[PDB]
Structures are given as C-alpha cells and as structure tokens.
C-alpha cells in the first residue's frame, strides 16, 4: 500500500471521525494509533 509516516494515526483519527463519531471513541482511537505512531517513529530515525 501507499502512504507517509503519519499516514496510520492520521487515518485512524478520521476513521474514527467519520465512523465513531464522539469524544470518548476519540480519545480511544487516538490513544492507540497516536502511540503506534510514536513507538513506530521512535522506533525509526528520522532525517
């Protein structure tokens, strides 16, 4: 597939935008894909 290196918690945040829809399905959703992305990226070395 395609995408960038924000990709994942940016299109988790909108999935859960569109389809979810609240803040406490929010704070769920981001919870998980904003720390995916951080151990993902801290995990990687960035230029």
């Given at each position: 597939?395609?995408?960038?290196?924000?990709?994942?918690?940016?299109?988790?945040?909108?999935?859960c935008?569109?389809?979810?829809?609240?803040?406490?399905?929010?704070?769920?959703?981001?919870?998980?894909?904003?720390?995916?992305?951080?151990?993902?990226?801290?995990?990687?070395?960035?230029?």
């Open positions: 597939p395609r995408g960038s290196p924000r990709t994942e918690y940016e299109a988790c945040r909108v999935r935008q569109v389809a979810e829809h609240g803040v406490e399905r929010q704070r769920r959703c981001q919870q998980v894909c904003e720390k995916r992305l951080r151990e993902r990226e801290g995990r990687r070395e960035v230029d």
